[PDB]
Design a protein around this nucleic acid. Structure first.
Lengths: 374, 32, 166, 176, 458
RNA sequence: GGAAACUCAAAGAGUGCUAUGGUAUGGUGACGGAGUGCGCUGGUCAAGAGUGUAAAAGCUUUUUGAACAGAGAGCAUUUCCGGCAGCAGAGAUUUCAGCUGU
């Protein structure tokens, strides 16, 4: 039997752990009968990931007791013998066995990754790379594993090339969830922000732009639109032109709501050229979307983008020097909108007035602003 | 080599010690 | 050497890694022919390394038509590029076992370092994983495979015949 | 090499080492040409403005009172430096510190046991020279009941271990 | 690598009362390395041993151990062991010869009158209660609870699990002692005739008939080590027998008078024989020395038994008396009955009990538990003897928790590896060797009157 | 013959269950981690060589070199760490991350 093999693999560490005079024979027999129970429950039939988890918790508890007893008996913090790594190696092998048997519970896979990362200097980052590789092989569609893999290899190791490779491979696998798109534009903005801040720092002590984020923004719009028109209206295109235009309108609503979220969490990256990097998404949304977002319905979205293009310089604090510089730009925007619109004219006028009043002695310059926007 | 309370707590976990269990079964005396 | 195995199925694509080769010369014998019926010995041959599930019945029907007419789709390209090692194209290609001798040319057109085998050894490896199915996958798919088979068969047939509900 | 193959306890017949190719990783590109539209877009932008980070290696490969006073710019450069930059910084600190420091009661019958002189061998078999050697070979049972599981496996694994379905090639040595 | 308990796991070898071959030299070096590794790793299993042996220890100098009462044990130990300490009061049929299965799961009692009952003594399940109205003498299980052999008025009969008669043996004319050899599948039979008969239970074939030539067989025991039979005669002579040689392998002069009982240790090292001359005698078996001679017992010891942990249970009628560490070489292990003035070098009884009404028929320790089953005139009594059983059995030799499927497959497997009756020798390790003829060196075929001095030439 | 069952046994057939060590964990300080050097993989370019030819082109090449892209799949050895504080930093009172000397 293989429980016999594993149990007698456990004996040299307790040889060493009895020789180093911290445990006695009668208590190490007790930890062996508990470990016998656990090994038999592991490699018998009807096994459970809770059996694996309880074995890992028991082995961590006897490791903590071993460390406590070592500090109290020998008054060293490690005996530099077999019995201080064998038990963590055992926990790692219980994790490997469990993930080979039940490779379906991401709770257990993430407990494996957490213990392997928190093992510290003693583990190897290529050993973490191996279990990231096989986990991403088994779950390519689950996207938080791609985010966690790239987050470990950028926010700990700062490996930009491999992080870009992870994000491009994940976007190859599931180019359908917008969350991976948003985390990729987030990673690219974080990388370019660290690039220009190390430039600023080398200047203060002693070309490559957000156009990467704009290009992945562009392919984000194109492929998310393609995958929504392929996901809905699923089997066939058996739908008349009313249902086809209803579908295409709804995909425009979907994609434009995601770009609204993109600008909403795009504004807080204010260390690069945030005006240019928001204005390029503005000009990428301003063009035609093949179903007349401006010249027909989604006119509310056209008014939303017009309000964004108006306040895109007026994204400011109550110190309104930019307003005193270019509020005539907002007035010309309201005039150019009300020169064409019918109820969106009154809506945009009242909305820009309410927005400027809410956002903006100090009340006397604000009395000038109220007389301006009255 | 003194004892320790945290050491004896997780030692009672690791060695599977029902000594406090039998102490509580003998102690609780149906007090309510 | 039959190193990897590609099993297409309605829930997605599976790449298996061949652990032990079956016998080539004794491949018609009684014990070799019924070891693929016994599951306790088939799991000595085949191990699952990857399973990319589909995005839904739309991508399922797209990949069913591409597998039917012998083309490599984009999800196939993704899973094969994730799983198969970057071997050489001139010396010792990596060996993938398929079940479709006219899908093989489409796989070498995309990955020149992959030689594809569909002869009787790859055929009975493939029908071993077809015979066991849900047991090899260790619990990692959504959806019952026969329920997805009913949906995909009806969708494939109505597509092939142009069934209009008008 | 013929002698060490004759003296080796176990021959694992994938003996010529198979040329292991680089593994199919999820940390890199397994084709090294842009494979998606995203990838070719990112690489044409990145070749308009390349990021091989030789500039970003030489930028952070520059940075007593440097030890005590600079406790803020040190943390700033620690957060700033990239992967190979931090590897070179660790190597520079290691080389700098290593350059800084160093009537009788028993009657046994002695008749011959003609029924079980067929359970003992007739003479001493070939490779041994005496029965002390030969019975020292037989003195330990290899059974499951008498050894541990690991010792049982070490005692019963055979010398020639082949793989069951692949070709065995002739041996090749490092330049004969 | 050192392993303080290796010499239990060591293995003796042949000695003459180094080599020039390179290949043979390295082969022998690998063999010695493998033997050392195997002994060390096999001896490291004592960590993995689950349970601990039982005991009872005095903790005072006023508290002797032989004056500890069975009710006091049953109060001091747990409810499962207290319920194992059974007592059946079967008054009307005769004194009950007791027998346990080789794992302690089944009990087989025989009344002297006719009452034979095979039962699961630890559940409440009997599976044969048959009243064979002629005087039965003894019984034993064969390889299971599924078959048992009973020695009746004359003929030995063999019954199945539920008690139907399978066989009436026309040989085995008057048995009084039956014992099964489980690795060899042999039912061994001796009694009022001076004959010893080995009968193969599997094939069905009478393997051996041997003239004891010493009258009726007074006692009989089996060496569990090497399966030779120690029979005790009316000469005071024990003789060790094998089914190959028609003469006894050894004849020992144990006692004066007859030999009332024989017991052998399970290690095959010590043998306790009680004679009718009020003499217990502890014998070395391997070297045939006489270790101890406890003469002048107060009344002749009618039974002896040896537990798996080496206790010695002697029974002298109403009394049962157990000694601990009595089967040892030193003279301080001679079993006494009192310590004259508190001598620590006197082996007083480990515990004693008095069956005040009756005279005990036989003794048998329950195999893997801490009990001694004594069968007497009014039935059965188990005694909680705390030092008296192997706490750590091996579950693939013989398992006390074995199921029906495990019984079936273990029956077929032990039937398949049944040892031939010719392999029974005085030492078990003598069937791999070479002859004690046929020279110990192998042979290389290369090795395969001044006038008369003148008159010489004539 | 019949009836009952949370009854006791003796057997037969089928089905279910990852039923998975092709030679068992990454590691008896004999160790691990970091880095370096050797080794290995892929494509590209250049050179060689063959073959072909008016010259070629092309094709072949277990021939070498170059920079590049890497794999974790090998091998050394004293290059450092698994020593101590002082100090700031990190995450949820425990663990984690670098400077000045022992």
């Amino acid at each position: 039997s293989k429980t016999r093999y594993y149990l007698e693999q456990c004996i040299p560490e307790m040889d060493d752990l009895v020789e180093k005079g911290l445990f006695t024979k009668n208590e190490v027999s007790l930890i062996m009968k508990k470990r016998t129970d656990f090994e038999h429950r592991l490699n018998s039939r009807g096994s459970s990931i809770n059996d694996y988890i309880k074995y890992i918790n028991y082995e961590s508890n006897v490791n903590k007791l071993r460390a406590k007893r070592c500090k109290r008996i020998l008054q060293v913090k490690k005996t530099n013998s077999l019995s201080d790594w064998s038990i963590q190696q055992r926990i790692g092998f219980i994790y490997q066995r469990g993930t080979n048997k039940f490779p379906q519970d991401l709770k257990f896979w993430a407990m494996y990754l957490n213990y392997m990362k928190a093992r510290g200097n003693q583990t190897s980052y290529k050993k973490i790379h191996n279990i990231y590789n096989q986990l991403l092989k088994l779950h390519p569609t689950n996207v938080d594993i791609w985010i966690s893999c790239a987050k470990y290899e950028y926010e700990v190791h700062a490996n930009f090339k491999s992080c870009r490779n992870i994000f491009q491979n994940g976007l190859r696998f599931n180019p359908d969830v917008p969350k991976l798109w948003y985390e990729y534009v987030k990673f690219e903005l974080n990388f370019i922000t660290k690039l220009i801040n190390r430039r600023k720092v080398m200047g203060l002590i002693n070309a490559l732009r957000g156009d990467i984020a704009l290009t992945i923004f562009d392919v984000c719009m194109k492929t998310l639109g393609k995958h929504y028109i392929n996901k809905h209206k699923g089997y066939y295109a058996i739908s008349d032109s009313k249902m086809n235009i209803e579908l295409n309108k709804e995909t425009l609503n979907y994609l434009f709501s995601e770009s609204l979220r993109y600008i909403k969490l795009f504004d807080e990256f204010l260390d690069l050229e945030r005006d240019y990097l928001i204005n390029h998404v503005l000009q990428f949304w301003k063009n035609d979307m093949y179903d007349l977002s401006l010249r027909k319905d989604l006119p509310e979205l056209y008014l939303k983008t017009v309000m964004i293009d108006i306040t895109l310089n007026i994204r400011y604090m109550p110190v309104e020097k930019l307003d005193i510089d270019q509020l005539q730009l907002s007035v010309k925007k309201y005039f150019a909108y009300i020169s064409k619109l019918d109820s969106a004219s009154v809506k945009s006028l009242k909305n820009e007035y309410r927005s400027y009043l809410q956002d903006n002695a100090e009340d006397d310059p604000r009395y000038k602003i109220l007389d301006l926007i009255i | 080599p003194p004892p320790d309370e945290e050491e004896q707590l997780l030692a009672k976990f690791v060695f599977g010690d029902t000594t406090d269990l039998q102490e509580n079964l003998a102690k609780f005396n149906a007090d309510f | 050497p039959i190193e990897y195995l590609l099993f297409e199925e309605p829930t997605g694509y599976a790449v298996f890694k061949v652990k032990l080769q079956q016998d080539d010369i004794g491949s018609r014998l009684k014990e070799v022919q019924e070891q693929i019926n016994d599951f306790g010995a088939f799991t000595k041959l085949i191990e699952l390394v990857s399973f990319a599930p589909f995005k839904g019945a739309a991508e399922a029907l797209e990949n069913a038509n591409d597998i039917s007419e012998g083309l490599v789709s984009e999800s196939l390209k993704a899973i094969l590029d994730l799983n198969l090692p970057k071997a050489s194209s001139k010396k010792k290609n990596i060996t993938l076992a398929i079940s479709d001798k006219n899908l093989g040319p489409s796989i070498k057109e995309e990955f020149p370092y992959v030689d594809c085998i569909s002869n009787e050894l790859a055929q009975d490896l493939i029908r071993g994983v077809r015979l066991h199915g849900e047991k090899l996958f260790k619990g990692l798919q959504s959806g019952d495979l026969e329920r997805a088979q009913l949906g995909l068969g009806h969708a494939y047939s109505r597509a092939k015949v142009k069934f209009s509900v008008q | 090499i013929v002698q060490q193959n004759r003296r080796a306890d176990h021959l694992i017949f994938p003996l010529n080492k198979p040329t292991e190719h680089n593994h199919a990783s999820a940390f890199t590109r397994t084709q090294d040409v842009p494979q998606t539209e995203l990838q070719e877009k990112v690489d044409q932008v990145l070749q308009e403005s390349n990021l091989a980070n030789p500039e970003k290696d030489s930028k952070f490969e520059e940075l007593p009172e440097e030890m005590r006073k600079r406790t803020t710019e040190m943390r700033l450069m620690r957060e700033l430096m990239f992967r190979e930059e931090r590897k070179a910084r660790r190597l520079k600190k290691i080389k700098s510190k290593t350059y800084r420091k160093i009537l009788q009661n028993v009657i046994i019958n002695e008749k011959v046991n003609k029924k079980n002189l067929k359970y003992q061998s007739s003479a001493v078999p070939f490779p041994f020279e005496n029965r002390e050697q030969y019975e020292r070979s037989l003195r330990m049972p290899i059974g499951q009941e008498w050894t541990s599981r690991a010792s049982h496996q070490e005692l019963i694994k055979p010398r020639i271990m082949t793989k069951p379905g692949q070709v065995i090639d002739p041996l090749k040595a490092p330049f004969k | 690598k050192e392993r303080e308990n290796q010499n239990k796991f060591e293995r003796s070898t042949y000695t003459n009362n180094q080599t020039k071959d390179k290949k043979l030299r390295a082969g022998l070096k690998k063999i010695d390395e493998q033997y050392k590794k195997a002994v060390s790793s096999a001896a490291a299993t004592d960590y993995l041993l689950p349970e601990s042996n039982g005991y009872l220890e005095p903790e005072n100098e006023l508290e002797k151990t032989f004056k500890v009462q069975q009710s006091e044990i049953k109060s001091s130990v747990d409810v499962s062991t207290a319920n194992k300490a059974l007592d059946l009061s079967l008054k009307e049929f005769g004194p009950y010869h007791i027998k346990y299965a080789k794992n302690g799961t089944h009990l087989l009692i025989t009344g002297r009158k006719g009452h034979v009952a095979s039962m699961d003594w630890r559940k409440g399940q009997l599976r044969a209660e048959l009243f064979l109205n002629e005087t039965c003498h003894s019984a034993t299980y064969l390889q299971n609870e599924q078959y048992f052999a009973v020695a009746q008025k004359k003929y030995t009969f063999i019954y199945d699990h539920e008690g139907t008669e399978l066989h009436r043996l026309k040989q085995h004319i008057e048995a009084r002692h039956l014992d099964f050899l489980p690795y060899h599948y042999l039912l061994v039979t001796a009694g009022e005739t001076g004959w010893l008969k080995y009968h193969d239970v599997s094939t069905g074939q009478l393997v051996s008939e041997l003239r004891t030539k010493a009258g009726p067989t007074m006692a009989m025991a089996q060496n569990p080590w090497n399966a030779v039979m120690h029979l005790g005669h009316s000469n005071g002579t024990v003789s060790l027998w094998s089914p190959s040689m028609p003469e006894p392998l050894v004849k020992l002069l144990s006692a004066r008078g007859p030999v009332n009982s024989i017991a052998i240790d399970r290690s095959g090292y010590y043998m306790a024989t009680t004679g009718a001359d009020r003499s217990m005698k502890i014998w070395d078996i391997r070297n045939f020395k006489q270790l101890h001679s406890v003469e002048s017992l107060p009344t002749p010891g009618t039974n002896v038994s040896i537990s798996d942990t080496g206790l010695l249970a002697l029974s002298r009628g109403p009394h049962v008396t157990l000694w601990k560490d009595a089967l040892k070489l030193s003279g301080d292990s001679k079993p006494c009955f009192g310590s004259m003035g508190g001598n620590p070098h006197r082996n007083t009884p480990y515990m004693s009990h008095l069956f005040a009404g009756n005279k005990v028929e036989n003794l048998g320790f329950v195999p893997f538990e801490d009990l001694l089953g004594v069968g007497h005139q009014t039935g059965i009594t188990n005694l909680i003897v705390p030092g008296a059983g192997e706490a750590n059995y091996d579950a693939l030799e013989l398992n006390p928790f074995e199921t029906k499927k495990q019984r079936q497959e273990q029956e077929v497997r032990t039937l398949l590896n049944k040892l031939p009756a010719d392999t029974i020798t005085l030492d078990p390790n003598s069937i791999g060797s070479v002859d004690k003829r046929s020279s110990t060196i192998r042979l290389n075929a290369k090795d395969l009157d001044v006038i008369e001095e003148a008159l010489s030439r004539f």
